């Protein structure tokens, strides 16, 4: 399999991503790498321009699932992995509710050999001291299932999920996601049946580190197909 054999052992990853949010400009880098052997990715990100005006749990969804394991008898339903090296175009809105949205867009491809998630994400209408401008997410993260299905007319595939944000008082703010993934190449992909993505998440902090920071464990499996 082309794609497939790409990610038969340790990937190498990088990440960037441009924001403005109300206005509030910052970029992010990040670095790691992934195992779809195992569905397992360790990321540490970076505010390069200084202090990250969203909560960090905030940009989890948007900051490859490309290393997802899907089980032996699912692998024809994995589009990520057959648009590669190509890659794709993973777009989404993401609805805080009661509060403002980010729309974002980016291309997710090899580089050589290092897989690479360049995202752009433009944030709007949030307000000034709601959960999100106002830093009060706890900072840590609840495992959700992506529920995939296939877009054939765009060669790819629609997700729609709710990702839920433990707030600092025992409330949660809800992040409803629509997600639009199209291949970069030209050729044929793999597009699946109905099916969802598990997904966990875990973030913590680098105590050498005093750059406003991220540490990011996941574990995304493929399941839904018996
Ligand atoms: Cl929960």
């Given at each position: 399999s082309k794609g497939e054999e790409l990610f038969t052992g340790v990937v190498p990853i990088l990440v960037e991503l441009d924001g403005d949010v109300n206005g509030h400009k910052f970029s992010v880098s990040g670095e790691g790498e992934g195992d779809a052997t195992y569905g397992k990715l360790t990321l540490k990100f970076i505010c390069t321009t200084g202090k990250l005006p969203v909560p960090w749990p905030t940009l989890?969804?948007?900051?490859v699932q490309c290393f997802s394991r899907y089980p032996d008898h699912m692998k024809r339903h994995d589009f990520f992995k057959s648009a590669m090296?190509?890659?794709?175009?993973?777009?989404?809105?993401?609805?805080?509710?009661?509060?403002?949205?980010?729309?974002t867009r980016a291309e997710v491809k090899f580089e050589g050999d290092t897989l690479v998630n360049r995202i752009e994400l433009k944030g709007i209408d949030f307000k000034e001291d709601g959960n999100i401008?106002?830093?009060?997410?706890?900072?840590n993260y609840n495992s959700h299932?992506?529920?995939?299905?296939?877009?054939?007319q765009k060669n790819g595939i629609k997700a729609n999920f709710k990702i839920r944000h433990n707030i600092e008082d025992?409330?949660?703010?809800?992040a409803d996601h629509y997600q639009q993934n199209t291949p970069i190449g030209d050729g044929?992909?793999?597009?699946?049946?109905n099916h969802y993505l598990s997904h966990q998440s875990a973030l913590s902090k680098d105590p050498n580190e005093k750059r406003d920071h991220m540490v990011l464990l996941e574990?995304?499996?493929?399941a839904g197909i018996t």
């Open positions: 989890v969804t948007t900051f090296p190509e890659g794709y175009v993973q777009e989404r809105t993401i609805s805080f509710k009661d509060d403002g949205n980010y729309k401008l106002g830093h009060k997410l706890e900072y299932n992506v529920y995939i299905t296939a877009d054939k025992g409330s949660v703010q809800l044929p992909v793999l597009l699946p049946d574990f995304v499996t493929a």
